[PDB]
Amino acid sequence: ANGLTVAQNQVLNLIKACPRPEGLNFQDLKNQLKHMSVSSIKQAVDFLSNEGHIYSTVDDDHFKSTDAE
């Protein structure tokens, strides 16, 4: 059922849960998850976008979760 990897689950969880009106911008995302390299986050973003979990809002790099934990 969890056809996602624990890191991507985590990233998604941060994006969905983080109590900011401005979703979780890529820069905020990386500042939180310092270990999660920019490329790896870009890959995660692509994946989670393709899964229809996250989407970009006010800017390309400004993500929110549609309704995915």
Binding site: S49, E51, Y55, S56, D60, T66
Partner: peptide
């Protein structure tokens, strides 16, 4: 670039 982004996400999610 940005348009029906949420709807696209819902569609992607649903179409699985």
């Amino acid at each position: 670039r940005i348009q029906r982004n949420k709807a696209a996400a819902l569609l992607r999610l649903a179409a699985r």
